[PDB]
RNA sequence: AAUGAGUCCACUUUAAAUCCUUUAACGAGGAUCCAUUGGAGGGCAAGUCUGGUGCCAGCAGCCGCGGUAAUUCCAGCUCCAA
RNA sequence: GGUGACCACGGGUGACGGGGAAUCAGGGUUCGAUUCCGGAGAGGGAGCCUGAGAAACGGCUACCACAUCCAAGGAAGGCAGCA
RNA sequence: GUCUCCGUAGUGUAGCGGUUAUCACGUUCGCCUAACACGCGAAAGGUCCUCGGUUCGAAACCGGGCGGAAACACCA
């Protein structure tokens, strides 16, 4: 924490997705890769925002420690951040849930429903028996 | 095949799209539109690879579906809409306008224009035919056709289409001594003046063009777009004024720029 | 199908005839004098010089004032004087044919640290580079075959994390210290 | 068949089995190249012999 | 939760061994009336109508045409309390090697004798096979069993007291001699060919009031076969002990490849780790496991399952090979072993170099007795003398042998199911014993 | 006798005692004997040599690195 | 004195992981944490060493070696090439 | 009438064609089933509905060769797609 | 898994419930030669595939198992 610094570059703003995006590098001379949460709040202090709208990813560390570079994303509002931002990053921040079944099981149910025609009760009870 | 193709491999994409090899297997495959897919710039790569407003196809799809991209004064939500030559791309939320013009190396460059200049657009007439009730027509280099043109307008001349009306306000005849631009082939992107036109019946006419620096080249007639009345262009030219300069005088320009910046 | 590239090329050529005393002795002399691991990484620099000389000879066969000849000749001479194997005043295609693989081997990082005196021998230089002790500018390099340019020549120095610049002594030093303090109160 | 296959492996059978002598490990790679360069490139011998081979059975 | 138990049916030739279990499976719901009537109509042509219930177990066409069981076969059903599977035995002098495999891959047994006159006497005798079967069950490790007498409907009078009493006392004193406890083992009268006394107490015979069984775990009373088998002792499961799995057979199923089939002795087998087969010393990742055409996530001990393996052929691994987890201690080829044996009967003296066939789990390998170490008392393992020169019947001894063919054996001190073995020659069990010390190659 | 096309050939066994590792009805792998369908050395009319027997290499058997599959 | 190959916390990566790069802590004196594959008559770099075998076994792409003192087979040692 | 020693016609191909690959004084000699373009095929043939576009086969019809279930009355097939 | 056949020196096989031998050989040794070639005469070579049972005694009479040669089935 004593020697960790954020530096921004390729900064630009767009109103198309209502955000400002940049590529940043953080300097840890002798420490591990800085945690994305730490980048989040430090960049929030940098741009006078809160560490709930900050979005960072793609942090690759140069050979031999020291510099690591990632792509930073800041939005004007959390509602816009929810509106246009990938669901996996929303789930990383905990704002999106993926509590669903496997792709294989989903395909099994989709193919089993094709054997039953029209009848709504037998079309919704298709996957009830072969669990 | 048993029908039309609706895929485009990444390596088989047009070279001027400046796509790489490792991102994926496929290319945008632009939808049918006013321009052929060989010389069109789809909006996905225009807003992802040229301006970096979007990082992915999904993001550029969101940008398009929020109805901010305006092409030729009309809102287009097609992610792979073929933009093409000198169609005005207007974004009002961020307030800039783009004119899609080839650079000196035959690639669509990011050319920014004022709104009062973006209000209009040059077109190259491709055919003139009279239709029913004796009504003349005019089909441009786009898919755009219009009725009741000036009878002085002939084939492969230039017309001034102002947006939001689709009408003609002025025109440039294809005449010796007029400023042109090459729209295909090796000399793509070169601004020059019509010096000669040799015509070969039953084949393609060849036009000889000299630029400002005196470099004279030639190209087929179908690759020429008249852009100026004599020597003043009717549009805003990109950087370099469409003057193709060789690698010998490109390298030392790079060295001078590096020396100035260092 | 797959979005790979599979564009690769070999960097060395084996000699046409094996088991000849003159070539074997010359290659062993080079290996011993420059601290190379095997014959592959001297055939590699021989192949590089062969490619450079082939390009220079072909350019020489081109006519004078030919713009392709001029452009590629200045490009090749610029690269040669950046890597430092050619003097800045010898900007001619004829002098490229006069080069030798010793000039290229002298520009290796392994030889350069030994010449600068960061290491006591060429083999010590190689192991010192491999154990992440040598840095160029700010990047640490662990590749002995790192060709050093003239601008990067001055910026070769010990790494900060290594126990030769900054602190943080090695594991054996720390173990010896803790054994010593566990033996003596 | 004329019946001469009964002698297969005869000499390898009769050969007395002597074990390999346990020896120090040999340096490999750059160290091996350094060693064999040092042996035959940096040395001065005052003895005659007309440049005898490296495996002299003197 | 539900516990799975293996049951093996042992009996004599033409003793209704398959017929009464066909009745059992039909009444408990393994087959249907349409299938059983199809079996009846198929038996109608060549006249073997008495074995229409037997052909459910007699899967082979050769078995059907010969009227006998050649090799063991498996079936499944669910009982009112827990889940069991059933194996039949050939019950024939020629197919002792076939039936001992099934009896070895067992948790419990049911023994069948025909109650008619002229068959029971031949069934229990020196030439009789009931003695051999009851011997080999305890030899291979059938801790608890039941007995059901079949075909008392052919007796005079049909369904009678005194015949039942005399036969149960005879078999009771025999099993008391061999070790089994008549109080623990249940005694049932069943009329196979007529189909009586499997689910309900048949009213044709009222003289039997039901049996009572008393065991160290608890007490139970029974009136029908289901009531008997719903109170059997649940065998222990040595899951913590590393994986051992002798192979009953190897099939080549079209679409999936080579599927070994065997009963899991120790440990848990699940798809997702590499396994090693001991006698052939080949390594292979398991792909899937499956019981009775039903997929499983685990193979608990006592489970007769077939498991699919990858990149091997049917000729690499054969019957009798034992598989085990390579991450744990891997089973592997044993040069020889030390065995303590109880010799049962042999017309001549037993000397060194005697090479009978040793039957251990599924492997049936001829082994030559390398030498004899000492003679052993019948009980307590008492020392008698050292360095024997000959042996006779009714004697226990320490013997070291090496199998002629490659074989994997496990000491009884480590793997109980693989420690048991039998010795067969002249169509009698010559010697019975266990393994103490094994060397490893 | 080759498995494909059933042709009968003669293959040299190239070491001191590797014939002892060869028995009847073995599945052997045979390669060329050096000069493209021409006899080599003092062996008349032999153009093939055994490389593997029973899916174990003759070199491995000769060096004792692994054993016959009993 | 210096380091990894490995154990292994965290970060990072990623749809989620893995791997790489970072980074705690262990981790080298036969540093047993063990480099192999083919050769040593010539072509063709390397032994007229020693012990067996005795035109046998075998080697040998080709010349050729082996019939009791084998620079060529089977081995030990030592050398050679990658 | 048309085509042929300027090689027709016929046969063979261990022939899909090309961009390309190996080798490398120059000239050449071999290889391109293989990710890009074009063609052809969906077990072998053949015939069709629909549709702008198919002689489609993860569409249909028939025959041939295989082959699944069956209560023997019938019914259902096409991995040169990913595994 | 079942069945059919075979299994004696190293090959080619006589063999008797009271004897496994010879033969073309194959090997070794003398036998002449620097090396041979040809040629003369002897010796060894068997748990009768293995293990047992019947018998006073078996290789052979019988029971197994093994290896090889034939076929029949064997689909978690
Ligand atoms: Mg040697
Ligand atoms: Mg073909
Ligand atoms: Mg091709
Ligand atoms: Mg294709
Ligand atoms: Mg088709
Ligand atoms: Mg079709």
Describe the structure.
Chain A is of the alpha+beta class. Chain A contains 5 helices and 4 strands; from the N terminus they run ββαββαααα. Chain A has one domain (1-131). Chain A has helices spanning 36-46, 78-83, 87-92, 103-114, 120-124, and strands at 5-14, 19-28, 54-61, 66-75. Chain A has a 4-stranded antiparallel sheet. The radius of gyration of chain A is 22 Å and the shape is elongated. Chain C has 185 residues and is mainly α. Chain C has one domain. The termini of chain C are far apart. With 441 residues, chain E is of the alpha+beta class. Chain E has helices at residues 17-28, 33-46, 61-66, 96-104, 120-123, 129-140, 161-178, 225-229, 416-419; strands at residues 4-10, 74-78, 83-88, 108-111, 144-150, 186-190, 211-214, 219-222, 245-246, 249-253, 257-263, 274-277, 282-291, 294-295, 304-309, 322-325, 337-343, 357-360, 363-376, 383-386, 395-403, 421-425, 428-438. In chain E, strand 13 and strand 14 form a beta hairpin. Chain E is globular and about 60 Å long. The B-C interface holds B 10, 21-25, 246-248, 251 and C 1-3, 5, 67, 70-71, 74. Chain E binds 3 RNA strands through strand 10, strand 11, strand 13, strand 15 and strand 19. Chain E: Residues 11-18 are annotated as: G1. Chain E: One of its GO terms (cellular component) is plasma membrane.
Tags for this model:
part of a larger assembly; 6 chains; A: 131 residues; alpha+beta; 5 helices; 29% strand; C: 185 residues; mainly alpha; 3-stranded antiparallel sheet; 9 helices; 3 strands; 52% helix; elongated; binds magnesium ion; RNA-binding; ribosome; In situ
Blueprint (SSEs and pairs):
The structure is cut from a larger assembly and holds chains A (131 residues), B (262 residues), C (185 residues), D (58 residues), E (441 residues) and F (70 residues).
Chain C: H1 21-34, H2 40-61, H3 67-83, H4 93-96, H5 101-106, H6 109-116, H7 122-130, E1 134-136, E2 139-140, H8 150-153, E3 156-158, H9 171-183
Antiparallel strand pairs in C: 1-2, 1-3
Helix pairs in contact in C: 2-3, 6-7
Chain D: H1 10-14, H2 30-41
Chain F: E1 11-12, E2 28-32, E3 48-53, E4 56-57, H1 58-63
Parallel strand pairs in F: 1-3
Antiparallel strand pairs in F: 2-3, 3-4
The complex binds magnesium ion (MG) (6 copies).
Chain E binds three RNA strands through residues 34, 38, 59-62, 70-71, 94-95, 97-98, 249, 251-256, 259-261, 288-294, 305-308, 319, 346-348, 353-357, 364-366, 368, 404-405, 424-427.
Modified residues (N6-acetyllysine) (chain E): 162, 169, 270, 389, 436
EC number (chain E): 3.6.5.-
Organism (chain E): Homo sapiens
